[PDB]
Amino acid sequence: SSTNVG
Amino acid sequence: SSTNVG
Amino acid sequence: SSTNVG
Amino acid sequence: SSTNVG
Prior knowledge:
The structure is a homotetramer.
Chain A: E1 2-5
């Protein structure tokens, strides 16, 4: 899984 | 899964 | 699954 | 599944 917040 | 917030 | 918020 | 919010 991956979570990316710019 | 992936969650991307610009 | 994927969630993308611009 | 996918959810995209511009």
